[PDB]
From a paper:
The integrated stress response (ISR) is a conserved eukaryotic stress response that senses and integrates diverse stressors and responds by reprogramming translation. Loading is catalyzed by the guanine nucleotide exchange factor (GEF) eIF2B, a large decameric and twofold symmetric enzyme that is composed of two copies each of five different subunits, eIF2Bα, β, δ, γ, and ε. The eIF2B decamer is built from two eIF2Bβδγε tetramers and one eIF2Bα2 homodimer. Upon ISR activation in response to a variety of stress conditions, eIF2 becomes phosphorylated, converting it from eIF2B’s substrate into an eIF2B inhibitor.
To this end, we prepared the apo-eIF2B decamer by combining eIF2Bβδγε tetramers and eIF2Bα2 and subjected the sample to cryo-EM imaging. After 2D and 3D classification, we generated a single consensus structure of the apo-eIF2B decamer at 2.8 Å resolution with most side chains clearly resolved. This map allowed us to build an improved atomic model of the eIF2B decamer. (E) Local resolution map of the apo eIF2B showing that the peripheral regions of the γ and α subunits are dynamic. Regions close to the core (chain D, on the left) are well-resolved and have clear density for most side chains; regions close to the periphery of the molecule (chains A and I, middle and right) are less well-resolved due to higher flexibility. Closer inspection revealed that ISRIB slightly draws the decamer's two halves together by comparison with the apostate but does not induce marked changes in eIF2B’s overall conformation. In the apo versus the ISRIB-bound state, eIF2Bδ L179 shifts slightly into the pocket, occupying a position where it would clash with ISRIB binding, and eIF2Bβ H188 (a key ISRIB interactor) adopts a different rotamer. Overlay of the apo decamer with structures of eIF2B bound to one or two copies of its enzymatically engaged substrate eIF2 also revealed unremarkable changes. We infer from these results that all of these structures represent, with the minor variations noted, the enzymatically active state of eIF2B, henceforth referred to as the ‘A-State’ (‘A’ for active). As indicated by the structure of the apo eIF2B decamer, the conformational equilibrium in the absence of ligand likely favors the A-State, which is further stabilized by substrate eIF2 and/or ISRIB binding but antagonized by eIF2-P binding.
Author numbering:
A (entry chain I): 1 to 10, 24 to 60, 85 to 135, 157 to 235, 297 to 334
B (entry chain C): 168 to 351
C (entry chain D): 8 to 98, 125 to 351
D (entry chain A): 41 to 279, 285 to 459
E (entry chain E): 167 to 517
F (entry chain F): 172 to 517
Write the structure that this text describes.
Amino acid sequence: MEFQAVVMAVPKPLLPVGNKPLIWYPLNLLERVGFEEVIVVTTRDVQGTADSLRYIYPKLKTDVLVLSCDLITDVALHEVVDLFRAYDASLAMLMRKGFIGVDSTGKRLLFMANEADLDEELVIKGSILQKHPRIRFHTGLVDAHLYCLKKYIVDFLMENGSITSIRSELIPYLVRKQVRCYVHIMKEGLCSRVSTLGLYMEANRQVPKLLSALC
Amino acid sequence: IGFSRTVEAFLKEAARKRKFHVIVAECAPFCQGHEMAVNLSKAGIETTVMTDAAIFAVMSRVNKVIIGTKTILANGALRAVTGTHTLALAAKHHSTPLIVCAPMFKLSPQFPNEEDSFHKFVAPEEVLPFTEGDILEKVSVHCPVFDYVPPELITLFISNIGGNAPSYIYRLMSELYHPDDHVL
Amino acid sequence: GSELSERIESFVETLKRGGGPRSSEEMARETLGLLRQIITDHRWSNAGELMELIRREGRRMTAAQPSETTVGNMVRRVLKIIREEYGRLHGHYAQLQSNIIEAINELLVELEGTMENIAAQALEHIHSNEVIMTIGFSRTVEAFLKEAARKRKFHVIVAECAPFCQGHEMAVNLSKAGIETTVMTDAAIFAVMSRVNKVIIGTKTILANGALRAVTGTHTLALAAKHHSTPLIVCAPMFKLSPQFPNEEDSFHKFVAPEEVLPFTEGDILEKVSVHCPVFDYVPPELITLFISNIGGNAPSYIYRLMSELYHPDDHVL
Amino acid sequence: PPLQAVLVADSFDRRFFPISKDQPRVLLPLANVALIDYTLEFLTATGVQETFVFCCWKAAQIKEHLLKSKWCRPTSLNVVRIITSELYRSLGDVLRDVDAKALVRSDFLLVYGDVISNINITRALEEHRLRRKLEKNVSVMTMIFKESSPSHPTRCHEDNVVVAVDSTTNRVLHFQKTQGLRRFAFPLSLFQGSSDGVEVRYDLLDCHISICSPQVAQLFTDNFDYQTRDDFVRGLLVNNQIHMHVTAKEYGARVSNLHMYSAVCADVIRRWVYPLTPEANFTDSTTQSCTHSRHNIYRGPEVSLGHGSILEENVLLGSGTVIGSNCFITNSVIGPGCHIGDNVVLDQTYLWQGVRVAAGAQIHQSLLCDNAEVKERVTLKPRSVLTSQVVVGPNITLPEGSVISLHPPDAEED
Amino acid sequence: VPTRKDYGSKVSLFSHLPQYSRQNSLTQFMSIPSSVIHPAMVRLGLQYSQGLVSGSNARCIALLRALQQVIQDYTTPPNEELSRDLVNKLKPYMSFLTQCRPLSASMHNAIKFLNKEITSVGSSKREEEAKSELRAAIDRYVQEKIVLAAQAISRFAYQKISNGDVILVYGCSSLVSRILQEAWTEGRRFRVVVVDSRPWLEGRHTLRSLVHAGVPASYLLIPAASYVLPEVSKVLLGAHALLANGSVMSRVGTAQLALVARAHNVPVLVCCETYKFCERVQTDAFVSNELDDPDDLQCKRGEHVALANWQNHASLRLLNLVYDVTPPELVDLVITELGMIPCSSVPVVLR
Amino acid sequence: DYGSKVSLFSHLPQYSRQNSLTQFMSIPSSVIHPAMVRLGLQYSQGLVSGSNARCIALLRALQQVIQDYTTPPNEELSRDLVNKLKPYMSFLTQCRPLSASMHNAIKFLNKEITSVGSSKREEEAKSELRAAIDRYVQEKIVLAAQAISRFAYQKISNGDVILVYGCSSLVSRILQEAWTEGRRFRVVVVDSRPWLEGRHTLRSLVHAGVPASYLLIPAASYVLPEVSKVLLGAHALLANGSVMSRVGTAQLALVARAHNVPVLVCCETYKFCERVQTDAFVSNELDDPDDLQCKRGEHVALANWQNHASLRLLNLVYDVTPPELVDLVITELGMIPCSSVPVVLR
């Protein structure tokens, strides 16, 4: 029992993506490798993220692996889980190319600003640059919204319930600071999240090539 | 060198999983190395046969030496067949390991005394035949079967209790025999 | 001859700045050509003026780079040629120039032929299923090895050099010919120097006592060979043979920037730590087995005679 | 087209002040050898065929030192030309004057008279020309930077810079200093237009070596209030493109202040600027020959070393310098014609020509210029600089950072 | 659990030693929520494969902490004896860890000690008592074999180091670093000379440690050891294992340095504890060694890599050795927590 | 070739004694001279195995060939003879590999033939060649042993225990001449298989009256402690100072050095070759492998050794000794060190 699976779905998960349920692709991603248990937070009719996560705090008792309501990707979970295992990282995330301040080696996360917060320019501290004099900045990549998180991070989220939508509130605070955050960029994967109509149609068009290998 | 059942088993136990080249130096008085080479080649080990004179000129491409002995002395030395001293000298000159496959019963508490009864002298018929002529009356022929091998030329001792160094045989002796029964 | 002075200055600068040609054969050929040009385009009546001028020019060229023990040898050879010619003609002040040029050309052609003269002696020392190892990268040893790989088969092991990993090129060149070569570091010499049957290496200079000033790392190889009693052969032409002894010499090695040993991006520790990067080293004669020269093999104990034959005792100081 | 460079042998900035009053900055003996000699040797070794030496402050001494030097000989392949003028006030004025005279033709290098480097520029210059020939009249400058550590002693805060360039094609998008500032600001235009491969670099040492183009001088004439190079780059980046070339296996640094002076000296003595070392004698001079021995100890002719003294680390003794008995010198540079006493400890001290130190003196991390003198029982602290021709009485203990000069207002007078 | 796959062409002489590449991992074909292997064991194997934990004692410490975690998280099954439960459960974990990276002598000794202790567990005591006893014995061992032994070795070696001496170290050994630090702290005034070797370049660790301590350390490569030895007076070396025949199975570049030192008349000292003594023998580095990732041998010289594509040549082999053996006649004495003993006394301590 | 050779000795020819090369030849030999034919047959059958005996027989056969050699018209003889003698040497080598003595002798003969000008008559040239061969033999073989006999007489003392190995035409002569001068010593004769040629020296010494002993080489370490000197003979002296002799010489010198016994070597100046060698692997000679067969006990163990495809039979002849084990060398010029061979070659 190294990791526990959790996927929030707060319809969207019932969209027939390729004549199959949209929530079936995330669950299939959490399959074929152990994972005899997975926590879903869909509505009662389905047969914030921080709030829904803390609502089931006493249930989880080990490292958590949070996914998105719908996430179609043909990546190997080990690729992202190795960063959490080897380096004993506190945060491990996955994303694909189209702030982020990934370092030279391409794994350590240094900067996580957003365009809405910054005033006009990009401010950078002197110490973080003293330690790492090279900061590779990415702007066009897309966020798949899946993270491998430790347990003490969940405890910290619980002891203060003033955090909502960890994607934009917790990850920047974690990167801002020992904590260890890492990222994995494929540059050749699918990594499609169904949020708008364009991505929905792209996923509908890409389904056959994935289903040919899945089934 | 020579013919030793323990060394033969040690060699043929590795041939079933490894491939090596075994060189066998015969014994001039009693050419018993031929039997060992034949028994080894019977199992496909790529053996070789040669005389005792070709032990140094050929021992430049060799890497390891594994031989037996008649008995192991107290200071680490041993009593081996004739010609083993030259083999050990060549091994030490080329800095090659010299493994000695000998069981525990071959350990003698006696030390290297001046060793008059050390070598076994046999009839000179093997060295020089009786049909030579009239020169046998004024020619002294000696045929020592065994020889003394110092410990400095040895590198390891493989026994039924694990490999050890020559500098630790005294403890094995102390554990085996009582110091009062050394002279018997 | 201002053009001659310009050529001399350019040669001295390229030798003191970053060296001349990359290989030693081209260096010796260029030095001999420059000496021939100096002998041709210059005025003199007696041989003493010519020989002292050549002495001064060679002294300048050596002061430009003392570690390049290839130009002083050519200067001493030209001086010995001049002295032999003067002794033959006097034992003279009107036709001594042309004959010196002829002798220099005779020396040049054999300088070039040295490579084949050395490579032709590969089958005399290499046998089938042999295990030979080398260190560094040398054209002479490369030819000596790849010339016998057609009819003979053996295993080669190349040890790279830590400061400048030049053995990779040699390993690749040998693998392109199908010799079954292996690459390793210079820190695993003694670890593998127990299954080796022979060693062949190339040097940069041969001292008077039969010693070698080769790249850094060959002294340990020679020590390991002498410990394991493995014959170590050195293939070097005659122009790599200098009339100087190991001691009685300062600036024996060449010290280059520590960038190759310890990079500049370490930090503040570079102010305390002292780093040294020697390019060459010294190998005593007692660890050498044979010398493959253009005139055949020779033991390290017969180098003094070649010295007395090639150079003049009065021209050792230069 | 023969490669030509422009040498500004005068830094209108005055950081060595008080020292720059009696004797120019570019002729201060670093390792018994002037800085302009290092710069000229670098230019002559990199392939430069012609140089234009501009001098305003104390130009007579510069020229009359150069005319004896080996670069002005008829046998030198890098013909140098001294242009002296009293109007120059900044580098921008020098470039304006070049444009007025039409001296330069092609890609020229812009370097100061106090740059020490062994970098080869053939590679970077090819990159520059090829880049300009794929985009006609687009690329205008190429700044050479040496990647280092932000911890290195050579990286002073006064010259420390931070860049944000594109990794696809090396190109400067933002350039600013970090003198007295803790969090850096980078505008959003960088990500606004292009530069998918954009990254911030803080591990770079500004060698002040730039492969310029005639268009640089043209733009310098257009904008009258360009007083230096840094402002040229800032004013061009607000608006032509400026690129870089990074080196990792070569050395390069500019002597801008006193702290920077003692940093290159240790490196030069420690052979970090090979082939440029004291052992090489790259000036063809007779009074600078030495012999390199173990531990990077350099000894010249007529060293007169006394019995008992111990040379422990990278020291450089001059020709004619006299050492006493039972001394201890380490990491110290001694000039020619110096003369030491007895029981004299020198630790990271730079003694120029004509110095005499009496017995019982302990000097640590301080610099003694020409004709300096100290009496017995005198102890000098770190950064305790003495200028020309001062004499310090006996039994005096100078505080740290003390500066003594014979000019009244320069510092604490004699 | 699947078997790891080799990488590249091995040498004819080392055809019996496995050779893997750190680019590929064995967890690619295993579950993320590990079912057969414990999660801590998976993390430890990943750290070993990626080269994060490459220390002689650090690997053993990490293994012991992982074993403590495993014993804490595990519960014995019904109607099953406890003494064999842990042994049967650890049997595959050692297999996995060996597949990730060949275990060292210290790890083998620690595993043997833990198996001994587990077999020594009684049949009447409950689960909590035995688990607590094992968890306490593990750290008791760590204390009485690593830190206390290191303190004793440093106390014994302090008297050998004197003022004005020049010590020559090699590689990265925490014991030698601690010895030098304590010697410099106790008032000894000396200077060290660090010798490094490619491709690991781990001597810089001890270099920066000594610089942090304030010792006038020096740095150079192993091929130039013959140039600095004429001025060296002592050679301190670390040992990864000491066999029954009195041979040091330390880093590959240690036997060469010892040979050059003996040729230059420099007494060499070896620091090692009593928990690295194994009841096995090895006469040469060929019969038993480890082959690391060969892709680490290639380097960038100039602007092109000569070994960029070494697998294209069908007659090109890459040998990347790790350890090697040195004969007993090269080591003068071996410093241990039981007093200074010669190299001919390893069996005496093993007895 | 006959039989399967060794992997490390696969670059050398392994002939046989039963397989004769005269089968595919005319009884009156047309292409080859009858004298050279019988000489090669003797070499192959082992009738002449002595280092100096082989050279003497070769030179006498060459004299016989020259005596009945007719120079064709339309060409000079100074070159025709050299061009004709080459196939004879090739056939001799095919019969049995040549030795250093034979090589030097044929080289000297070729040089002498080339020194003959076409200005001279045929009969005069043949007579001069015969006289030259005769005097060269007398100088380098006959007179080259009388000076070595009186030089080694100084190093022989009363009560000495000299140890010899194999068979040598010079060692036996040295000992027999030193015994008659007044010295009273005893010799230890060492022999090895399968040639067992030391019995020749044993008999030659017994017939002279010198107390002699006989033992096999494996027991050399047992008798060396009582030995005072080791006098050995070799076939060639390489240019690198090394010595080329019988296979049982290098290890003998090694054991002598281990027992602290001074080793000596006696060789003629004409055996001073110009090549070099480092081991007995690059240039050796493999004789018939069936010589190792021995009637030990009731039957032979290597009677059908070829049935075992994995079994090889090595029968090396020569070996190379390093200069690190040779102390003194005796020649007609005088007592010289082991590292002075090139000086004599000069």
